[PDB]
Amino acid sequence: RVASGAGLPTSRQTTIMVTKYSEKSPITIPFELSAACLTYLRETFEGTI
Amino acid sequence: TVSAPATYGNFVLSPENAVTAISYHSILADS
């Protein structure tokens, strides 16, 4: 606000609420892994270098 | 009598029973 005006009072209390709108968007990609290689993780080998 | 190999090899891990153990992994859904 500019209060310099002697005869001019602002009509508003300067608390103007403003609504906006959200926009959701999917984020999806194909992915893959080898279960035949995963079985080495499943079986916890330790017997040979 | 004739001697035969016991373990199938050194590189493979025990048990010698092999397939009988892995079947339990499916149903659940010294060296």
Taking only residues 15 to 44 of chain A, the set having a beta carbon closer than 8 angstroms to any beta carbon of chain B reads 42
Say yes or no for a CB contact (<8 Å) between B11 and A48.
Answer: yes
Q: Which amino acid does the sequence have at B22?
A: I
Chain B residue with the nearest C-alpha to that of A47: B13
Cis bond leading into A9, ω under 30°? Answer: no
DSSP A44: T
Q: In degrees, to the nearest 5, what angle opens at C-alpha A40 toward C-alphas A35 and A44?
A: 140
Q: Where are the alpha helices (DSSP H) in chain A?
A: 35-43
Is the Cβ–Cβ distance between A1 and A10 less than 8 Å? yes
Q: How was this structure determined?
A: cryo-EM
